[PDB]
Motif scaffolding. Structure first.
Motif, PDB file in Angstrom:
ATOM      1  N   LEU A 126      -6.153  -6.233 -14.783  1.00 47.85           N
ATOM      2  CA  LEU A 126      -5.029  -6.419 -15.594  1.00 47.85           C
ATOM      3  C   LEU A 126      -4.205  -7.511 -14.918  1.00 47.85           C
ATOM      4  CD1 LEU A 126      -2.623  -5.622 -17.526  1.00 47.85           C
ATOM      5  CD2 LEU A 126      -2.157  -3.736 -16.026  1.00 47.85           C
ATOM      6  N   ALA A 176      -4.271  -7.459 -10.332  1.00 47.95           N
ATOM      7  CA  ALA A 176      -5.041  -6.428  -9.324  1.00 47.95           C
ATOM      8  C   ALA A 176      -6.213  -6.199 -10.173  1.00 47.95           C
ATOM      9  CB  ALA A 176      -4.185  -5.460  -9.126  1.00 47.95           C
ATOM     10  N   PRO A 177      -7.435  -6.050  -9.562  1.00 44.78           N
ATOM     11  CA  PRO A 177      -8.800  -5.716 -10.193  1.00 44.78           C
ATOM     12  C   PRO A 177      -8.648  -4.070 -10.070  1.00 44.78           C
ATOM     13  CG  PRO A 177      -9.369  -6.550  -8.105  1.00 44.78           C
ATOM     14  CD  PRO A 177      -7.694  -6.868  -8.245  1.00 44.78           C
ATOM     15  N   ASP A 178      -9.428  -3.452 -10.920  1.00 43.76           N
ATOM     16  CA  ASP A 178      -9.272  -1.888 -10.826  1.00 43.76           C
ATOM     17  C   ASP A 178     -10.765  -1.317 -11.512  1.00 43.76           C
ATOM     18  OD1 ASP A 178      -8.350   0.433 -10.377  1.00 43.76           O
ATOM     19  OD2 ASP A 178      -6.855   0.489 -11.597  1.00 43.76           O
ATOM     20  N   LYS A 179     -11.709  -0.950 -10.541  1.00 43.24           N
ATOM     21  CA  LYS A 179     -13.103  -0.362 -11.116  1.00 43.24           C
ATOM     22  C   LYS A 179     -13.714  -1.553 -12.015  1.00 43.24           C
ATOM     23  CE  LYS A 179     -11.031   4.261 -11.090  1.00 43.24           C
ATOM     24  NZ  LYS A 179     -10.446   5.324 -11.993  1.00 43.24           N
ATOM     25  N   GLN A 185      -4.223   2.682 -11.135  1.00 40.58           N
ATOM     26  CA  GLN A 185      -4.300   2.269  -9.993  1.00 40.58           C
ATOM     27  C   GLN A 185      -3.618   0.730  -9.767  1.00 40.58           C
ATOM     28  OE1 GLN A 185      -7.822   1.931  -7.495  1.00 40.58           O
ATOM     29  NE2 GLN A 185      -6.793   1.214  -5.613  1.00 40.58           N
ATOM     30  N   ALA A 186      -4.050  -0.093 -10.781  1.00 41.13           N
ATOM     31  CA  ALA A 186      -3.557  -1.416 -10.754  1.00 41.13           C
ATOM     32  C   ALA A 186      -2.195  -1.414 -11.140  1.00 41.13           C
ATOM     33  CB  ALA A 186      -4.533  -2.371 -11.581  1.00 41.13           C
ATOM     34  N   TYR A 227       0.873  -1.218   0.092  1.00 37.19           N
ATOM     35  CA  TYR A 227       0.025  -0.031   0.011  1.00 37.19           C
ATOM     36  C   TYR A 227       0.710   1.188  -0.041  1.00 37.19           C
ATOM     37  CZ  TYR A 227      -4.327  -2.485   0.826  1.00 37.19           C
ATOM     38  OH  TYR A 227      -5.444  -3.238   0.648  1.00 37.19           O
ATOM     39  N   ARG A 249      -4.934 -10.448  -1.127  1.00 36.17           N
ATOM     40  CA  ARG A 249      -4.692  -9.062  -0.559  1.00 36.17           C
ATOM     41  C   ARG A 249      -6.155  -8.643  -0.819  1.00 36.17           C
ATOM     42  NH1 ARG A 249      -3.477  -3.750  -2.111  1.00 36.17           N
ATOM     43  NH2 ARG A 249      -3.067  -4.335  -4.181  1.00 36.17           N
ATOM     44  N   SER A 250      -6.584  -7.894   0.453  1.00 35.21           N
ATOM     45  CA  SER A 250      -7.969  -7.182   0.140  1.00 35.21           C
ATOM     46  C   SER A 250      -7.638  -5.773   0.774  1.00 35.21           C
ATOM     47  CB  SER A 250      -8.992  -7.979   1.369  1.00 35.21           C
ATOM     48  OG  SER A 250      -8.769  -7.762   2.620  1.00 35.21           O
ATOM     49  N   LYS A 251      -8.688  -4.927   1.182  1.00 33.81           N
ATOM     50  CA  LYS A 251      -8.568  -3.706   1.399  1.00 33.81           C
ATOM     51  C   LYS A 251      -8.199  -3.428   2.899  1.00 33.81           C
ATOM     52  CE  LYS A 251     -11.743  -0.921  -1.137  1.00 33.81           C
ATOM     53  NZ  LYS A 251     -13.210  -0.113  -1.274  1.00 33.81           N
ATOM     54  N   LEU A 304     -11.930  -7.122  -2.630  1.00 36.36           N
ATOM     55  CA  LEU A 304     -10.520  -7.473  -2.919  1.00 36.36           C
ATOM     56  C   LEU A 304      -9.634  -6.513  -3.629  1.00 36.36           C
ATOM     57  CD1 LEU A 304      -9.136 -10.201  -3.398  1.00 36.36           C
ATOM     58  CD2 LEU A 304     -10.185 -10.286  -5.826  1.00 36.36           C
ATOM     59  N   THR A 305      -8.394  -6.503  -3.328  1.00 30.70           N
ATOM     60  CA  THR A 305      -7.417  -5.439  -3.966  1.00 30.70           C
ATOM     61  C   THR A 305      -6.339  -6.094  -4.834  1.00 30.70           C
ATOM     62  OG1 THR A 305      -6.343  -5.412  -1.924  1.00 30.70           O
ATOM     63  CG2 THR A 305      -7.512  -3.461  -2.447  1.00 30.70           C
ATOM     64  N   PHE A 306      -6.043  -7.298  -4.305  1.00 30.11           N
ATOM     65  CA  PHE A 306      -4.973  -7.988  -5.124  1.00 30.11           C
ATOM     66  C   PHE A 306      -4.968  -9.461  -4.877  1.00 30.11           C
ATOM     67  CE2 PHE A 306      -0.800  -9.530  -6.508  1.00 30.11           C
ATOM     68  CZ  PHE A 306      -0.800  -8.906  -7.736  1.00 30.11           C
ATOM     69  N   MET A 363       1.054  -3.261  -9.417  1.00 31.28           N
ATOM     70  CA  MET A 363       2.214  -4.402  -9.724  1.00 31.28           C
ATOM     71  C   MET A 363       3.336  -3.813 -10.178  1.00 31.28           C
ATOM     72  SD  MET A 363      -0.203  -5.473 -13.057  1.00 31.28           S
ATOM     73  CE  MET A 363      -1.782  -4.807 -12.460  1.00 31.28           C
ATOM     74  N   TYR A 403     -12.112  -2.979 -14.454  1.00 34.61           N
ATOM     75  CA  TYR A 403     -11.205  -3.985 -15.107  1.00 34.61           C
ATOM     76  C   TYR A 403     -10.319  -4.425 -14.235  1.00 34.61           C
ATOM     77  CZ  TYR A 403     -12.476  -0.575 -18.828  1.00 34.61           C
ATOM     78  OH  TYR A 403     -13.035   0.214 -19.753  1.00 34.61           O
ATOM     79  N   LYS A 446      -8.208   3.596 -16.806  1.00 41.05           N
ATOM     80  CA  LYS A 446      -8.725   3.142 -15.530  1.00 41.05           C
ATOM     81  C   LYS A 446      -7.961   2.122 -14.858  1.00 41.05           C
ATOM     82  CE  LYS A 446     -13.563   4.048 -16.762  1.00 41.05           C
ATOM     83  NZ  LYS A 446     -15.124   3.589 -17.075  1.00 41.05           N
ATOM     84  N   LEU A 447      -6.696   1.729 -15.545  1.00 34.48           N
ATOM     85  CA  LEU A 447      -5.975   0.730 -14.957  1.00 34.48           C
ATOM     86  C   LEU A 447      -4.785   1.474 -14.322  1.00 34.48           C
ATOM     87  CD1 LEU A 447      -6.674  -2.163 -15.271  1.00 34.48           C
ATOM     88  CD2 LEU A 447      -7.530  -0.639 -17.328  1.00 34.48           C
TER      89      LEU A 447
END
Lengths: 37, 414, 96, 96, 101, 96, 96, 89, 96
Positions: G88, G81-84, B4-5, A29, I72-74, G66-68, B9, G86, B1-2
């Motif tokens: 990737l 990682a999910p994002d809104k 943040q992701a 984070y 991994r979550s929030k 879920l963040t990762f 990584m 989508y 929109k990617l």
């Protein structure tokens, strides 16, 4: 009491002790004049 | 929109390239030191390199004051007729394969320093006399502040820049030295890089009147300078002529003291982090000299038989320092163990390769050696090289004071 | 296109130093001040012209270009009697 | 620039009219399933009433009057550049 | 002592430390005596004629400069020259008392 | 308050600070004259920086009269001799 | 946008990375650098998994999200990682 | 009394017996942890109070397609546990 | 058993670890560092997520098996270690 509980804990705990430190040492984070009108 | 992701990584593609190998060096050098009496070894850790700076010399190294794994590397060209562009790169131990932040400069980067309070700001000087202030929070490659001819700059290459406490108006301040003999305080006011000429270096004893009536007064080229740990106005200037000028910020015309340090160019002058009276000097004269600021004569003399590129005090104790030479050898000294010879001397590079800079990690017991071809090598000190004896800075002060008084008792008698 | 008479004077300012004058010459300072003054007069010409074009001609042309001739409402559907205001009143006022 | 800006006035006015008239019958389906009676998401341009005049059903006002008045608006939009005096062009298209 | 006579001035209504000055050479000098005391912060060549009148809008952002030719130039100063800094009055109160003392 | 504490130590001392005995002239005046000259070159450094901050002829002479009765000392006279010639140089510039 | 594609090229040029796919919340890939059939079954099968991974985590904690997700198999770790709207996918071999 | 807010999604009755479903599900969630008995307690209380035949579905992940009599069906969230009560018989 | 618990207390004593438990290849806890009701809900859901991760590994390629799983979550990170008959699942907060 089964012996397969012992070696599974040793095998996966070696993965845990190695990879918990991977979560600890790295923070996921961690977000790094006057013009003329 | 990617966005943040992909940022998550990118930081964290570098996990198995960090902690499969960071906990490796925590217990990898526990070998053969119970059988070796007093000689340590340098353990080969990872090598940091980029393709954009293969022909450029590493000219400055500085760890991040906050991060134990992130460090900033600057690239220049010590060759006077092979000057070129200058790179500013930051490497993390998390990503030994790829640097974290890439920056570029038109002129050869020869000095950098990271603000201790603000680890995201690095002041970088170049061969053309420009000092630039890069912001790590901004992903852009441009510096936030940069000096120029209109805003004030050096006409000669900048060799050392060092961050400093904020001035009388609470604006960020750093000092620079250059070959034009001008020690300039640079102040960060709003969006400007204001320059203040503090000390103009002049050479004494060579003011000769040429027989038609003009005096080009000699200007001592500045190479290295560091500030005192406790005394705010106290700092030293390491010069090209082999002299050390003990100076103050409030005295712009008179040096407090002058030491005839060496006879070729003094590459690095640094203060002891524990002892307030001990500073050290290295030069291309192959001698490594340790000094007290109250005594003219050098307390120790260490002839390394090769041009000492850079030295750095270790911050775990006050009696150990490191030296790197142009023949590829890294020298480790401990005054409490050996007052006359290096406890460790291992060639960390080839004979063709010339070492340029060296520094220590603040917490992890690993060092970094710079290079004249851009190479960076990490090296963990052995347990023989970090052997510990009560604790405290006053303990290290009293430990070095006994070493100071004994050599004072050496020079009184001998 | 329009400043080639005055740029000829700028071309009359630069040429003695490029070809005729040398570094050993003692009239450099007079040539320095003559070039500086004529460049300074060129600075005054450039900034006034830049102000009268970057804003004055461009923004007023942009302001009238951005004017919509039909103020289309979204609160009431147009009728036969309602659309007469669009045809006559604001169309003429927009034309003015 | 002045013809181009004036053409941007007419082309933005005509596109705004064309976009507003081009509205789907079910364009209020995003709100609820009974969008036939409620007002649309983008407001309908016209409002009429449907009544019987035996033997025909006549909608009021006439749909042909809607097209004519919209054309009269277009004509007065077309009449707007007539009232604007032109400068610095001799001939654009006025025969030979 | 400037090379030209000074013709009008106006304090900043939002900044106690900022005043503006005019000359007969069409030069508007922006002064701010925490940044620089003896020199103006910004110098502008507004016009080539003699300025005579100067007025500043109450928000401190817009500046009107009248010349000898009957023209008026409207100038929008920077946010650094039109926004009150933190305790800028307290900076002004101290040195005004110090220089009066 | 730091200045209050150091004078309280002198006031609270068991031995009087006004203790006067034989050969005390060479005991402390040599240290006292060292502090006077160190303060003189510190005040002289302050005056030189303020002289560079002096923006005019009358204010520099007022500052010269502010730091008067000490510039007759030879060391600060050598320090301020160049700035007198600087005051000469910009009196020329004011005359020009 | 430019930073997003630069990171994608940087992630593809990372040591040991075998795969990069951009998929929406239905299982349809959008941006991919590889052949489609390996891309499609990578997209569809773990979209079934990310519907199970997010449900299992949210079953544990209603306010969590879920963040990762890391799926370390014997060859590599599925690093995603999910994002809104989508998610990737990075298919990276840590030993390569 | 846990502060589980009754997030009502679809409640096809009058408002009075909507609260009876909320209160009984609150009692069922307080008295039981297994979703068997939570769905049992809501149904057995409603069978006694509003005649046969009721059916209750209690869980955290389920997609339900059921057919229910008019004025005799609620679907709501009580905290996080979802309750599907419908009458058919 | 003594060496088993020594590693497992060391795993709990590591930084950021919230709770550690062992669920089998069937869905039942064996030992836990949490309460019974929270662990059983953790055991049934994460094991069924673990074999779903294992299912996602084998339909990608049948010669592959899952060896490690991070979720991994929030709020926290779930760390599943699959074996032949046991799953060493650790709840750890990397921010701690």
């Amino acid at each position: 009491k089964d012996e397969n509980y012992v070696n599974a804990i040793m095998q996966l705990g070696s993965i845990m002790e190695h990879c918990i430190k991977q979560n600890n040492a790295i923070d996921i984070y961690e977000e790094y004049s006057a013009k003329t009108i | 929109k990617l966005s943040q992701a992909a940022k998550i990584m990118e930081r964290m593609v570098n996990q198995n390239t960090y902690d499969d190998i960071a906990q490796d060096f925590k217990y990898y050098d526990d070998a053969a030191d119970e059988y070796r009496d007093q000689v340590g070894t340098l353990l080969p850790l990872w090598k940091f390199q980029n393709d954009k700076a293969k022909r450029l010399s590493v000219t400055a190294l500085c760890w991040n004051p906050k991060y134990r794994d992130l460090f900033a590397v600057g690239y220049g060209s010590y060759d006077f007729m092979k000057q070129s562009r200058g790179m500013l790169l930051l490497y993390s131990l998390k990503n030994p394969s790829f640097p974290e932040y890439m920056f570029s400069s038109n002129s050869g980067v020869m000095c950098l320093d990271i603000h201790v309070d603000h680890p995201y700001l690095v002041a970088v000087g170049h061969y053309d006399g420009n000092v630039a202030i890069y912001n790590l929070k901004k992903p852009h490659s441009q510096p936030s502040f940069c000096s120029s001819a209109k805003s004030g700059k050096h006409s000669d290459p900048v060799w050392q820049v060092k961050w400093q406490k904020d001035d009388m108006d609470q604006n960020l301040n750093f000092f620079s030295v250059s070959s034009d003999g001008r020690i300039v305080s640079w102040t960060l006011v709003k969006r400007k890089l204001v320059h203040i000429d503090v000390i103009k270096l002049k050479v004494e004893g060579s003011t000769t009147e040429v027989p038609e009536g003009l005096q080009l007064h000699p200007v001592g080229c500045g190479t290295a300078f560091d500030f005192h740990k406790e005394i705010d106005y106290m700092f030293l200037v390491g010069t090209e002529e082999g002299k050390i000028y003990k100076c103050s910020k409030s005295y712009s015309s008179q040096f407090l003291d002058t030491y005839d340090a060496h006879n070729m160019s003094v590459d690095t002058v640094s203060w002891n982090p524990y002892h307030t009276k001990v500073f050290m000097s290295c030069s291309s004269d192959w001698t490594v000299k340790i000094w007290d600021h109250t005594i003219k004569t050098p307390m120790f003399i260490y002839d390394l038989n090769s041009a000492v590129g850079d030295v750095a005090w270790a911050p775990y104790s006050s009696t150990v320092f490191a030296a790197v030479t142009t023949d590829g050898k890294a020298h480790i000294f401990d005054l409490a163990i050996n007052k006359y010879e290096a406890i460790c001397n291992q060639p960390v590079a080839a004979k063709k390769n010339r070492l340029t800079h060296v520094q220590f990690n603040l917490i992890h017991p690993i060092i970094i050696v710079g290079d004249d071809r851009g190479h960076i090598i990490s090296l963990k000190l052995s347990p023989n090289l970090r052997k510990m004896p009560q604790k405290g800075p006053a303990v290290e002060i009293a430990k070095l004071d006994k070493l100071l008084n004994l050599v004072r008792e050496v020079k009184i008698k001998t | 296109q329009l400043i080639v008479p005055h740029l000829a004077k700028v071309d009359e300012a630069l040429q003695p130093g490029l070809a005729a004058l040398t570094w050993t010459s003692l009239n450099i300072e007079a040539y320095l001040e003559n070039t500086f003054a004529k460049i300074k007069d060129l600075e005054l010409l450039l900034d006034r012209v830049n102000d009268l074009i970057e804003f004055r001609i461009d923004a007023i042309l942009e302001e009238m270009s951005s004017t919509p001739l039909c103020q289309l409402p979204q609160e009431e559907p147009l009728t036969c009697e309602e659309f007469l205001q669009m045809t006559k009143d604001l169309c003429v006022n927009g034309a003015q | 620039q002045n013809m181009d800006a004036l053409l941007k006035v007419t082309r933005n006015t005509l596109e705004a009219i064309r976009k507003r008239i081009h509205s789907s019958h079910t364009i209020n389906f995003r709100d609820s399933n009974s969008a036939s009676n409620m007002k649309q998401n983008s407001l309908p341009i016209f409002r009429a009433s449907v009544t019987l005049a035996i033997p025909n059903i006549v909608m009021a006002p006439a749909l042909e009057d809607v097209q004519q008045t919209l054309n009269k608006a277009v004509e007065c939009i077309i009449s707007v550049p007539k009232g604007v005096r032109q400068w610095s062009s001799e001939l654009l298209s006025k025969k030979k | 002592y400037h090379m030209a006579y000074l013709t009008d001035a106006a304090w900043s209504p939002v900044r106690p430390t900022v005043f503006f000055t005019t000359r007969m050479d069409g030069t508007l000098d922006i002064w701010d005596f925490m940044f620089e005391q003896c020199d103006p912060t910004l110098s502008l060549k507004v016009c080539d004629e003699a300025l005579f009148c100067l007025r500043v809008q109450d928000n401190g952002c817009l500046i009107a400069c009248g010349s000898q030719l009957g023209t008026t130039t409207l100038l929008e100063v920077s946010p650094g020259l039109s926004t009150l800094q933190r305790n800028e009055k307290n900076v002004a109160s101290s040195m005004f008392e110090r220089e009066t003392r | 308050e730091e200045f209050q504490e150091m004078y309280r130590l002198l006031s609270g001392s068991s031995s009087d600070c006004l203790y006067l005995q034989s050969t005390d002239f060479e005991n402390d005046v040599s240290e006292f004259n060292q502090k006077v000259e160190d303060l003189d070159r510190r005040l002289g450094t302050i005056f030189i920086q303020a002289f560079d901050d002096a923006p005019g002829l009358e204010h520099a002479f007022k500052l010269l009269d502010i730091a008067g009765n000490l510039l007759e000392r030879p060391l600060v006279a050598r320090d301020t001799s160049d700035k007198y010639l600087v005051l000469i140089q910009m009196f020329n510039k004011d005359l020009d | 946008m430019a930073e997003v594609e630069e990171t994608l090229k940087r992630l593809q040029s990372q040591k040991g990375v075998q795969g990069i796919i951009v998929v929406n919340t239905e299982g349809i890939p959008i941006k991919s650098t590889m052949d489609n059939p390996t891309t499609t079954q990578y997209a569809s099968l773990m979209h079934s998994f990310i519907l199970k991974a997010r449900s299992t985590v949210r079953d544990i904690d209603p306010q969590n999200d879920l963040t990762f997700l890391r799926i370390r198999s014997k060859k590599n770790e599925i690093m995603v990682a999910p994002d809104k709207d989508y998610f990737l996918i990075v298919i990276q071999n840590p030993t390569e | 009394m846990c502060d589980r807010k009754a997030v009502i999604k679809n409640a096809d009755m009058s408002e009075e017996m909507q609260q009876d479903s909320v209160e009984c599900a609150t009692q069922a969630l307080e008295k039981y942890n297994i979703e068997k008995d939570i769905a049992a307690h809501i149904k057995k209380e409603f069978d006694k109070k509003y005649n046969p035949t009721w059916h209750c579905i209690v869980g955290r992940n389920f997609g339900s397609y059921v057919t229910h009599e008019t004025k005799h069906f609620i679907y709501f969230y009580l905290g996080q546990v979802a309750i599907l009560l419908f009458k058919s018989g | 058993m003594a060496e088993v618990e020594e590693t497992l207390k060391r795993i709990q004593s590591h930084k950021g670890v919230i709770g550690t438990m062992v669920v089998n290849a069937e869905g039942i806890p064996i030992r836990t560092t949490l309460d019974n009701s929270t662990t059983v809900q953790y055991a049934g859901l994460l094991h069924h997520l673990t074999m779903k991760a294992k299912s996602t590994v084998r339909d990608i390629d049948p010669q592959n098996d899952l060896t490690f799983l991070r979720i991994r979550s929030k709020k926290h990170e779930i760390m599943v270690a699959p074996d032949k008959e046991y799953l060493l699942i650790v709840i750890q907060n990397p921010c701690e």
